[PDB]
C-alpha cells in the first residue's frame, strides 16, 4: 500500500499550482497498492531489542540438558534430529520461519550443530575442551559456514556474534598460521548469520570491520611463515567483505547516520584494486571529511605511485603519464606513520612493483653499461637479504654476474606474469615484520 | 465525452494523450467526472468493446492505463498520484517496443514528449527519498530500466523508432551519470553503432552529436583514458562553434564542455588560446586556469599541487582531481627538465647532468614535503613528490618518451646527446604522448 500521510503529501507538493481553475474538484481515492518498482527491503540500521519465545528458550534448555545426559553420539544426534523436526513444525505454526527473522542461538555454536559434527568427526581440536575428548565443548565450539530455510535456533542474534567474534580475537588469533582454514571458515559463517537476519546495524558494521582486519593480518602471517595457502580465495573473500562493508556505509549515510570507522575502510577498498580507475571516481563522490582523512589520503597516494604506464596484463588498457614512482613507494612503506594493516595489504604488489622498477630502469641504460651491483638494488627495492634478490633474478631470467651484480639489459619479459611459470611466492618487508612483533594481535585488530 | 477521446486515440490522434496537466487539465477533469463511477474491470471492458480499436494488446492496456490514470489522478498530490503516472508511462513504452505496433509513427512524438516530463518528475521524487522510505535514485533507476528495454528493442531494418535512437541514447547516459552509476554507459556505447542504420554518424542532428561526444568523452575520462576523452571533447567543441551563439543556451553548454576540455588538453600538453573562449568562460575562470598554466608551463610542481588543493572541491565534483593529480606532475617535470637542459647543455655545452644538480633543482620546484618538519601529516598533495627520487623522475621521463637520455646509477648522473637543438633532446609533449597512446578517430563511422 502506498504511504498516505498528510505531512509527506504536503512536503512533495501538487502537480499543478491551481487545480481548481482547470475544473478539478477535490476527491477521495482508495489507498492503492504499492507499485512493484517501489518495494524495497530496508536493512536494519538501528539496535533492535532481543526477544525470544518462552517456549523456544525452554526447548534449548531441554537440548542442553539432554546433551549432558546422553553420552552416545549417535543416540544424541537422533534424539536431537527428531526434536528439530517437531521444532520446525511448531515454528511454522508460530510463524517465525519461512518476514522479519531473528536468531535465538544463545551459545556460540548451535546445540544441534555441535551434535551433527560429533558423529561426523569434523570437530577441530580447538573446539574440543580437551584433545582426547570426543564431544565438542559447548563453550568453545563455533558454527560452520552453511551452504530448507534456517530455523531461529540455528542462527544466532547479532549481540551474540559480537561476543563470538571477541572469543575468536582473544583466544584463537595466536593459533595462526596452523588454524588459517579454521578461522577463515568460521568468520565466513559469522557474516552468513548477519545476512540471514538481514541485519546491517552497528553490530554488523563492527563485526564486518574486524573480519577485514583479521584477513589482512592472516594475509601477512601466511606469507611470513611460508605456508602454502589459497591466495585468490583469501583475496576474493576480503574483497567481498569490503564492497559489502562499503555498501552499508552508503545506506547509513543515506539514512542520515554515521559510521566512526568509515574512513579507515574506504582506504582498504582503494587498495583492493590498485589499478582500477572505478574506485578513483567512487572516492571522489564521498563527503569532504571522508576524502580528507589521513587513511584515505595515504591510500590514494599509493595508488598514484603504483600507477605505471607500461603495466602489461591481459585485459588491461594502459593510461597516459603514469608516475611509476617505485622509489617513492618504498619510502612510504618505511614511514612510521603508515598504518600497519595498510602495509600488509600493499605487500601483495611487491613482486609487480619491483619488476616494473627494473623494467623501467632497463630501458634507460646503454648497451655498454656495467651490471648493476646487488647492493644498489637492495637499497632501492628493499630486498630483505641477498637470497631474496638472487631468487628474483632467477625467476625472470635476469643474468647475474659474479654473484653480486645484475645484468639488466638481459631482461626480456615485458609483463610481470609468465604464462608457463607459476607465480613467484609472495614476499614481505622486514620493516613491517618488526613493527608487528611490537604489537599484540588483539590490540592491532581492535585498533 | 469519454467515448470521444477513445475515438481520438483509435484513429491515431494523440493531442490529448499527455501527462502534463497544464495543456490537458480541462479535458481530463471532464473525463474524470464522467469516469468517477466505474471499476477497473469496467474500464478494460469499455476499451475492448470500443469500435475500431486496434487488436494489439499493447495498445489496449496503454489506453486502459491512461483512463485509469485520468479516473484516479490527484492534482493536489504528486506523490499520491505518482503510481498512476509511472504505470502509464511503462505501458506507453511497452506499446512502442514492437516495430509494427499500430500508430507507431504518431506515437514517437508522444514518447519523447512524455519522457522529458517523467524525467523531471522522477528527479523531484527522488529528492525526497528519505521521507518516502525509498532508496536514493530509485525513480530515475526505474525509468532507466524502462528506456534500456526500449533501447535494446531498436534494430536496423526512415522509421520513427530509428529517428530517436541518438536522442534515446543521450537520455539514457544522462540518467546513468545522474544516478552516479556511469559505468553502465559502457553497454550503451558498445551497441549504439550496430543499432544505427545511418551510413555515417554525422547524419544525425548536430545538437545530438555534441551531446553524445560530450558524454562519451566524459565517460572516457572516468576510465583515465585522457587521449580518447580529449578527442571527443575537442571534436564536440569544434562542432559547437559552428552553431549560432544567440541562443544563450549554447553558451551555457559551451562552458560545460570546456570545464572538461581544458584540464584534459593540459594533460596532453596542449595550451588553449583565451581569445575564442572569451564568451564561453567568465573572467574569473580564465584567471583560475591561467594560474595552472603558468605553474605547469615552467615546471613548478609545488604550484601545481597548491592549485589542485585550492580548487579541490569543484574539481572533485567533476571527477577531475584524481586524474589531474595523476598526469599533470609528469608534464610539469618535463618542462622543468627542459628548462635546466636548455641552460646547461644547449648553452654551456655540458651533456652530463649530475644527479646533485637535478636534486637541488627538484627541491626548489617541490619544496616542503611529507618528510620535512613543516608537513607533519601526509596529504594527497605533499606525499607523492620528493626531491630525493632524482633517478625515479628521470627514469619515468625516458620511458614515457618525453626525454631522450641515458642514466648511470653508479656515476650518479644522466648523459644526454650533445646537440644545440633542444628538439633532439626533449621532444614536444603532445607528439610523444599521442604517438605512444593512439586514440580512436573522432569520426565514429
Amino acid at each position: 500500500y502506498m504511504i498516505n500521510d498528510a505531512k509527506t503529501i504536503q512536503l512533495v507538493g501538487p502537480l499543478i499550482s491551481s487545480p481548481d481553475n482547470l475544473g478539478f474538484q477535490k476527491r477521495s481515492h482508495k489507498a492503492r497498492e504499492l507499485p512493484r518498482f517501489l518495494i524495497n527491503q530496508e536493512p536494519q540500521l538501528e539496535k533492535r531489542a532481543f526477544v525470544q519465545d518462552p517456549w523456544d528458550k525452554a526447548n534449548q534448555e531441554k537440548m542442553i540438558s539432554l546433551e549432558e545426559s546422553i553420552d552416545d553420539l549417535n543416540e544424541l544426534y537422533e534424539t536431537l534430529k527428531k526434536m528439530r523436526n517437531t521444532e520446525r513444525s511448531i515454528m511454522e505454526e508460530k510463524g517465525l520461519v519461512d518476514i522479519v527473522f531473528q536468531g535465538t542461538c544463545l551459545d556460540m555454536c548451535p546445540t544441534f550443530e555441535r551434535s551433527r559434527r560429533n558423529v561426523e568427526y569434523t570437530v577441530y581440536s580447538y573446539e574440543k575442551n580437551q584433545p582426547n575428548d570426543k564431544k565438542a565443548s559447548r563453550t568453545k565450539a563455533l558454527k560452520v559456514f552453511a551452504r530448507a530455510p534456517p530455523l531461529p535456533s540455528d542462527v544466532r542474534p547479532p549481540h551474540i556474534l559480537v561476543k563470538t567474534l571477541d572469543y575468536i580475537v582473544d583466544n584463537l588469533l595466536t593459533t595462526l598460521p596452523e588454524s588459517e582454514g579454521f578461522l577463515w571458515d568460521r568468520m565466513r559463517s559469522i557474516r552468513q548469520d548477519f545476512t540471514y537476519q538481514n541485519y546491517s546495524g552497528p553490530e554488523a558494521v563492527d563485526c564486518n570491520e574486524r573480519i577485514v582486519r583479521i584477513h589482512l593480518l592472516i594475509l601477512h602471517i601466511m606469507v611470513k611463515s611460508n605456508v602454502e595457502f589459497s591466495l585468490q580465495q583469501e583475496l576474493e573473500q576480503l574483497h567481498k567483505s569490503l564492497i559489502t562493508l562499503s555498501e552499508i556505509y552508503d545506506d547509513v549515510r543515506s539514512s542520515g547516520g554515521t559510521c566512526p570507522n568509515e574512513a579507515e575502510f574506504r582506504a582498504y577498498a582503494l587498495l583492493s584494486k590498485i589499478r582500477d580507475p572505478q574506485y578513483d571516481e567512487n572516492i571522489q563522490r564521498l563527503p569532504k571529511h571522508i576524502f580528507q582523512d589521513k587513511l584515505v589520503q595515504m591510500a590514494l597516494c599509493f595508488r598514484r605511485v603504483i600507477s605505471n604506464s607500461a603495466y602489461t596484463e591481459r585485459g588491461f588498457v594502459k593510461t597516459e603519464n603514469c608516475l611509476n614512482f617505485y622509489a617513492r613507494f618504498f619510502q612510504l612503506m618505511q614511514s612510521p606513520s603508515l598504518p600497519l594493516l595498510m602495509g600488509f595489504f600493499l605487500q601483495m604488489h611487491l613482486t609487480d612493483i619491483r619488476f616494473y622498477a627494473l623494467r623501467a630502469l632497463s630501458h634507460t641504460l646503454n648497451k655498454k653499461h656495467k651490471p648493476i651491483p646487488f647492493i644498489y638494488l637492495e637499497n632501492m627495492l628493499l630486498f630483505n637479504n641477498r637470497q631474496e634478490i638472487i631468487e628474483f633474478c632467477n625467476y625472470y631470467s635476469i643474468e647475474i654476474i659474479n654473484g653480486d651484480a645484475a645484468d639488466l639489459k638481459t631482461l626480456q619479459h615485458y609483463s610481470h606474469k609468465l604464462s608457463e611459470t607459476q607465480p613467484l611466492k609472495k614476499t614481505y618487508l622486514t620493516c613491517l615484520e618488526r613493527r608487528l612483533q611490537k604489537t599484540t594481535y588483539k590490540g592491532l585488530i581492535n585498533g | 465525452m469519454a467515448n470521444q477521446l477513445l475515438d481520438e486515440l483509435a484513429h491515431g490522434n494523440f493531442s490529448h494523450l499527455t501527462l502534463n496537466l497544464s495543456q490537458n487539465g480541462r479535458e481530463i477533469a471532464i473525463l474524470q467526472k464522467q469516469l468517477t463511477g466505474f471499476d477497473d474491470k469496467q474500464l478494460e471492458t469499455f476499451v475492448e468493446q470500443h469500435p475500431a480499436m486496434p487488436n494489439d494488446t499493447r495498445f489496449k492496456i496503454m489506453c486502459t492505463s491512461f483512463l485509469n490514470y485520468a479516473r484516479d489522478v490527484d492534482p493536489w498530490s504528486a506523490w499520491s498520484s505518482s503510481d498512476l503516472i509511472f504505470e502509464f508511462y511503462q505501458c506507453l513504452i511497452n506499446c512502442l517496443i514492437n516495430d509494427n505496433a499500430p500508430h507507431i509513427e504518431m506515437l514517437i512524438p508522444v514518447a519523447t514528449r512524455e519522457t522529458e516530463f517523467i524525467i523531471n518528475l522522477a528527479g523531484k521524487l527522488d529528492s525526497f527519498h528519505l521521507q518516502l522510505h525509498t532508496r536514493s535514485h530509485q525513480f530515475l533507476s526505474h525509468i532507466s530500466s524502462i528506456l534500456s528495454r526500449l533501447f535494446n528493442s531498436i534494430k536496423p531494418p526512415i522509421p520513427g523508432k530509428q529517428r530517436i535512437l541518438l536522442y534515446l541514447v543521450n537520455k539514457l547516459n544522462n540518467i546513468y551519470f545522474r544516478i552516479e552509476s556511469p559505468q553502465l554507459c559502457s553497454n550503451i556505447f558498445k551497441n549504439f553503432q550496430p543499432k544505427s542504420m545511418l551510413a555515417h554518424f554525422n547524419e544525425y542532428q548536430l545538437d545530438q552529436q555534441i551531446e553524445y561526444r560530450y558524454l562519451l568523452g566524459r565517460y572516457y575520462l572516468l576510465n583515465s583514458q585522457v587521449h580518447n576523452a580529449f578527442v571527443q571533447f575537442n571534436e564536440a567543441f569544434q562542432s559547437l562553434l559552428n552553431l549560432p551563439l544567440t541562443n544563450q543556451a549554447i553558451t551555457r553548454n559551451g562552458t560545460r564542455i570546456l570545464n572538461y576540455m581544458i584540464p584534459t588538453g593540459l594533460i596532453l600538453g596542449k595550451m588553449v588560446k583565451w581569445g575564442p573562449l572569451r564568451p564561453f568562460l567568465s573572467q574569473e575562470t580564465i584567471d583560475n586556469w591561467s594560474v595552472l598554466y603558468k605553474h605547469v608551463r615552467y615546471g613548478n610542481i609545488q604550484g601545481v599541487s597548491l592549485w589542485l588543493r585550492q580548487n579541490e572541491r569543484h574539481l572533485c565534483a567533476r571527477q577531475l582531481l584524481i586524474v589531474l593529480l595523476e598526469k599533470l606532475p609528469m608534464v610539469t617535470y618535463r618542462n622543468l627538465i627542459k628548462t635546466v637542459i636548455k641552460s646547461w647543455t644547449t648553452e654551456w655545452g655540458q651533456n652530463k647532468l649530475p644527479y646533485s644538480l637535478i636534486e637541488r633543482v627538484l627541491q626548489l620546484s617541490i619544496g616542503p614535503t611529507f618528510e620535512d618538519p613543516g608537513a607533519q601529516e601526509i596529504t594527497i598533495y605533499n606525499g607523492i613528490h620528493s626531491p630525493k627520487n632524482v633517478e625515479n623522475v628521470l627514469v619515468t621521463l625516458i620511458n614515457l618518451g618525453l626525454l631522450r637520455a641515458n642514466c648511470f646509477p653508479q656515476l650518479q648522473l644522466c648523459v644526454v646527446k650533445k646537440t644545440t637543438m633542444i628538439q633532439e633532446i626533449v621532444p614536444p609533449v603532445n607528439e610523444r604522448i599521442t604517438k605512444m597512446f593512439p586514440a580512436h578517430s573522432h569520426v565514429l563511422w
Binding site: N366 | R404, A405, N406, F408, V415, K417
Partner: peptide, 6 residues
C-alpha cells in the same frame, strides 16, 4: 659516455 637511443 655518449647517448644511444633504444
Amino acid at each position: 659516455l655518449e647517448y644511444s637511443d633504444n
